[PDB]
Amino acid sequence: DINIDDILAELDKEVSPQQDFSDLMKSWKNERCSPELLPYPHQLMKRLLNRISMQSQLIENISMGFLDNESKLPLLCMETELERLKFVIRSYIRCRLSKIDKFSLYLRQLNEDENSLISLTDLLSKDEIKYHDTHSLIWLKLVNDSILKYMPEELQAINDTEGSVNMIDEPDWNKFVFIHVNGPPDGKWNEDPLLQENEFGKPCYTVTIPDLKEEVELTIGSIYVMRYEVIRDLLRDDKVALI
Amino acid sequence: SHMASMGYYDIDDVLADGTEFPCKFQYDIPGLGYLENNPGRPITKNTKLSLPLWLARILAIVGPVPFVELLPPDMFSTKVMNAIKTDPVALDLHSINSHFFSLAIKWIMLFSEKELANVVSELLLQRAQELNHHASSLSITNIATSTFLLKLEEMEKEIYKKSHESYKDTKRWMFKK
Amino acid sequence: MYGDLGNKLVLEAKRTKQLYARSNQDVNLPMYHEDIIRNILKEVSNLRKNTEYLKEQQQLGMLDDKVAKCQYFVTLLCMERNKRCLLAYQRLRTDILDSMAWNNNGLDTNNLSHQEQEYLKEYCDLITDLKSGDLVDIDLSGSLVPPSDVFIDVRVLKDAGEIQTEYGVFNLIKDSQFFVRQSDVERLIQQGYLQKI
Amino acid sequence: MSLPAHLQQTFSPEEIQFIVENEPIKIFPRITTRQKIRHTRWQLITTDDKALNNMVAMRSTEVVLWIALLLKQQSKCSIVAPQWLTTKELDRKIQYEKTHPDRFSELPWNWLVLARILFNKAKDDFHDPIHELRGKIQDLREIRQIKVLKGLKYLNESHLQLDNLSLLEINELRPFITEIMDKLREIHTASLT
């Protein structure tokens, strides 16, 4: 049989608001579910905060025409869509503000560490850099006055890593998370160097979990309970999403 | 050394570190008699004290011959190991120690013990089956649930409260708006 | 011995952690243990006097190689433990004050220490600085329950008369009912003037 | 903190509903919005506007589920249940479930959530009698709950695989499976040198 389909595909070949919302939903789901503070979607967030400002002005402008068919369902939908969209962004920001609270001394440690692999301004919004730096002084003043004032000088450090317990609470890198194995974000599987076939045909990624010296194959389109430290590189590269 | 999953400000870790373990001193030490409840005496070699784990965990490491030996505690005696291995579900761990699993992990760190790590991994996995049955079962409590929650640690009560509210909020959403 | 006051402070921390999660409402957090905390801070001061009274006696010659190597180290460990109990208690009360500052005062002051009355003000001022800026278009102190709901029936639970709100005017007559867009009434529902949903 | 404790590591069932309401659903419009060649318009920013300004009464179309429910709240729509909400396709999935103890059947990730939404809001739009659909949604719910209880005998230090489990069935189990596997990992890594 002569298989034509590549000739038919070459004959056949003759950023958007709908896409950015789908990246906000990915970001919100991964941020809720991950133990780490993920890096902020800088350009995505600037785009969405424009569209909310322009759309909220448009809904008010259309409501000026109603003073003078004149069906109201599209006004109702444009309004309920802004409530649905503003909720995802509020729930997203309130979630990552909660992680800046937990990780203040760890983020301060990445910022005092001049040799760091990460700059804090890669990781945080301008309003999160504001929240972080000032919530740290507000809390530090509270404890520093209220109880640290009385301590001997070598115990006055709020962030002593040398003591009997480390005071800097780091993320739980090995948290178990549920993942759904997307495959590459492009449908074009042949690009990917990590991906490979199996027996039963089906493709997968292989990852080694180093404490146990165990390889595991993450077959595409299936759900695993898996340690986050093993997933990070696949999650940053969009190969998997957190359920 | 300390593991990052148990926190500085974590109240149930602060309380676990407070529990006493039996300790033999390996040295004579002036001034430290307040540990024996008499400040005026020295500590004497082969005194058998009980010290809080936040003191004992550290004195066991430094002095090579260190300041203290930790003696094997009652809660990890072979009696408790045998009771764990026959019937994990029936066992009243909240009477053996209210913080048994947090203390088990600290003991397995402090002396590497593949033996105790097996026994405590199994105790956890077997009691987790019953924690899921009692968390899943929602009234439209029973004695057969309440008799189990009284047998229950301050670690496993978090998992129970959290799992139960997870099933309960799901029922609450499916069977009304 | 010295840690036994700290354990009483953290048992009060644990009871307030349970209290604030068991009870469905925002409870008023219980009164600050100024007395137990003054006992702990007084014991830390006596452990400091013992570090001073040891550190001199090293030069006077009292077998410091053994004696100070243990006595300083145990005195220091007691003060690490008292610092941890105070910090674990004070962080828990901080977590609850931040929860009030978002949940309620974002839209009982006798119980708080004066540093906490101050901290709660400075933190409410930080919340209003985040929402008063860029990101103003979304009301960050607003609801985290998703907007699955468009118009709602609401029953006005307390008399409050004619009131303004940004979106419009309502006469909140005791036991009248409105059918109105959820986004307009949501803050009045939170303040408890309105009932349903 | 900024985020409530019951949300700190998981989604509320109402957030799992909100995620499912973002999916496309097929509808039969009861309004013609399509203007003839021979007026207000939708102008949305998170979904495809071009599907709604081109409605013609009783020709099917796809819209995002939260708009289908908002139209169906008036008489202005009817919601076409997916092919898997048929008494034939549910009964093939029940047979698959009974036949393969080792696996969950290939139901879509949102099947419990979408069944619960449409049985309440679109109760009149099923071709099959809704009491037999509710009956088979329960038959599937119960078989998968047995297979879940069998799966939990294997909690592990390394991983699990849970191939066709729904988002709502993952979301009830999340604070148990992950909390126990976290303590099994802590007990294990503590034993290592």
Domain limits, chain C: 1-143, 144-197
Residue at token pair 């503590």: D190
| Interatomic CA distance for residues A124 and A137, integer angstroms | 18
Of A107, A138, A169, the last residue of a domain is A169
In this structure, what token pair is assigned to residue D132? 């037999």
Residues A27 and A146 in one domain: yes
**What Å distances lie between residue B20 and A55, B16, B56, B97, CA to CA?**
64, 9, 8, 11
- Determine contact, residues B52/C74, Cβ cutoff 8 Å: no
Alpha-carbon distance A192 to nearest alpha carbon in chain B (angstroms)? 35
| Interatomic CA distance for residues A169 and A110, integer angstroms | 13
Q: Which residues of B touch C70 (CB under 8 A)?
A: 27, 29, 32, 67
Q: How many domains does chain A have?
A: 2
Comparing CB atoms, the residue among C74, C78, C92 nearest residue B11 is C92
The number of residues in chain D equals 193
Comparing CB atoms, the residue among B3, B101, B162 nearest residue D175 is B162
Resolution (A): 3.7
Residues A97 and A115 in one domain: yes
The β-bridge partners of D25 are D63
Q: Is A63 helix (H, G, I), strand (E, B) or coil?
A: helix
- Determine contact, residues C13/C88, Cβ cutoff 8 Å: yes
**Residue A222 resides in a domain:** yes
Residues A64 and A179 in one domain: no
Residues A162 and A199 in one domain: no
What is the Cα C17 distance to its own chain's centre?
11
**Residue A212 resides in a domain:** yes
Candidates B8, B28, B55, B67: best to mutate against C (most CBs of C within 10 A) is: B55
Residues A99 and A182 in one domain: no
Rg (CA), chain C: 26
**Residue A7 resides in a domain:** no
Alpha-carbon distance A222 to nearest alpha carbon in chain C (angstroms)? 28
Residues A23 and A80 in one domain: yes
**Residue A88 resides in a domain:** yes
- Using a 10 angstrom Cβ sphere, with 0-12 exposed, 13-18 middle and 19 or more buried, the burial of residue B95 is exposed
- Determine contact, residues A219/A202, Cβ cutoff 8 Å: yes
Residues A159 and A194 in one domain: no
Strand order through the sheet with B68-70:
B48-52, B20-25, B68-70
- Determine contact, residues A179/A240, Cβ cutoff 8 Å: yes
**Residue A4 resides in a domain:** no
Q: In terms of Cα–Cα distance, which of C119, D137, B151, C50 is closest to A144? A: C119
Quote the Cα angle for C49-C51-C55, to 5°. Answer: 120
For C:11-40, CB contacts with A below 8 A are 37
**Residue A140 resides in a domain:** yes
CB count within 10 Å of CB A141 equals 14
Q: Which residues of C touch D120 (CB under 8 A)?
A: none
Q: Extract long-range pairs of D148-156: CB within 8 Å, 24+ residues apart.
A: D148/D173, D149/B132, D150/D101, D152/B128, D152/B129, D152/B132, D152/D177, D153/B129, D155/B125, D155/B128, D155/D180, D155/D181, D155/D184, D156/D181, D156/D184
**What Å distances lie between residue A225 and A57, C31, D25, D39, CA to CA?**
44, 43, 30, 52
Residues A164 and A191 in one domain: no
Candidates D186, D189, D193: best to mutate against B (most CBs of B within 10 A) is: D186
Residues A179 and A113 in one domain: no
**Residue A105 resides in a domain:** yes
Q: Which residues of C touch B18 (CB under 8 A)?
A: 3, 6-7, 10
Comparing CB atoms, the residue among A29, A177, A209 nearest residue D158 is A209
CB count within 10 Å of CB A46 equals 10
Residues A95 and A126 in one domain: yes
In single-letter form, the type of residue at position A102 comes to K
- Determine contact, residues D76/D29, Cβ cutoff 8 Å: yes
Q: Extract long-range pairs of B153-157: CB within 8 Å, 24+ residues apart.
A: B153/B93, B153/B94, B153/B98, B153/B99, B153/B100, B153/B101, B154/B12, B154/B15, B154/B94, B154/B98, B154/B99, B155/B12, B155/B99, B155/B100, B155/B101, B155/B102, B155/D183, B156/B93, B156/B101, B156/B127, B156/B131
In this structure, what token pair is assigned to residue C97? 């004050």
Residues A47 and A145 in one domain: yes
**Does the distance separating the beta carbons of C146 and D17 come in below 8 Å?**
yes
Strand order through the sheet with D77-79:
D61-64, D24-29, D77-79
Q: Which of left, alpha, beta for A203 (phi over 0: left; psi -120 to 50: alpha)?
A: beta
Of A113, A142, A169, the last residue of a domain is A169
Q: What is the CATH number of the domain that holds A27?
A: 1.20.58.1030
Residues A196 and A233 in one domain: yes
Alpha-carbon distance D33 to nearest alpha carbon in chain B (angstroms)? 31
Domain that holds residue A34: 15-169
What is the Cα D80 distance to its own chain's centre?
15
Specify the experimental method: cryo-EM
